Design an enzyme around this catalytic site. Sequence first.
Site, PDB file in Angstrom:
ATOM      1  N   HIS A 138       7.892   5.690   2.752  1.00 37.00           N
ATOM      2  CA  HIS A 138       8.663   4.892   1.775  1.00 37.00           C
ATOM      3  C   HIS A 138      10.150   5.140   1.786  1.00 37.00           C
ATOM      4  O   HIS A 138      10.822   4.391   1.088  1.00 37.00           O
ATOM      5  CB  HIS A 138       8.123   5.093   0.357  1.00 37.00           C
ATOM      6  N   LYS A 146      -1.394  -1.122   8.525  1.00 33.86           N
ATOM      7  CA  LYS A 146      -1.325  -0.965   7.072  1.00 33.86           C
ATOM      8  C   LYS A 146      -0.830  -2.281   6.509  1.00 33.86           C
ATOM      9  O   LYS A 146       0.223  -2.761   6.940  1.00 33.86           O
ATOM     10  CB  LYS A 146      -0.344   0.123   6.671  1.00 33.86           C
ATOM     11  N   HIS A 185       3.724   8.638  -4.864  1.00 35.37           N
ATOM     12  CA  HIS A 185       3.284   7.277  -4.581  1.00 35.37           C
ATOM     13  C   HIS A 185       4.401   6.325  -4.956  1.00 35.37           C
ATOM     14  O   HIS A 185       5.143   6.545  -5.913  1.00 35.37           O
ATOM     15  CB  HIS A 185       2.033   6.823  -5.377  1.00 35.37           C
ATOM     16  N   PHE A 186       4.472   5.221  -4.192  1.00 39.18           N
ATOM     17  CA  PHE A 186       5.303   4.077  -4.569  1.00 39.18           C
ATOM     18  C   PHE A 186       4.385   3.140  -5.357  1.00 39.18           C
ATOM     19  O   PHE A 186       3.488   2.526  -4.822  1.00 39.18           O
ATOM     20  CB  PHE A 186       5.848   3.388  -3.325  1.00 39.18           C
ATOM     21  N   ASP A 187       4.578   3.112  -6.679  1.00 43.00           N
ATOM     22  CA  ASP A 187       3.626   2.387  -7.532  1.00 43.00           C
ATOM     23  C   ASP A 187       3.912   0.887  -7.589  1.00 43.00           C
ATOM     24  O   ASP A 187       2.960   0.102  -7.550  1.00 43.00           O
ATOM     25  CB  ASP A 187       3.618   3.017  -8.933  1.00 43.00           C
TER      26      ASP A 187
END
Length: 124
Positions: free
Chosen positions: A12, A41, A119-121
């Site tokens: 990210h 992905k 995490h990239f939410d």
Amino acid sequence: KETAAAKFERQHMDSSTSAASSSNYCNQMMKSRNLTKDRCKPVNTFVHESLADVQAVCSQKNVACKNGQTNCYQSYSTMSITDCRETGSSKYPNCAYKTTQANKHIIVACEGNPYVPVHFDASV
């Protein structure tokens, strides 16, 4: 093995570019950042800010994660981000992505000691 924090960085962070202006940014970055083994992905976001400025989000606006958990944080400001979304004609192993660029607030999930993004939410 790669920690969760390290995985977040690989997947990210892209501090060395200010934005994605090339239609091929995602095609190149998804491969370079090891997001195309076995399957493409499908969807992934890169953040064009310093690592320290993204880490700083873990003490910014506490918000719920999209699953309702409480360890998420929204950036006060918009940040430069790029969404990479597998196209409708992509076929592994030749993974093809649509690149889109925008300034949006980021929402990260933070965990650990040190308390850092894992995490990239979401983006807003």
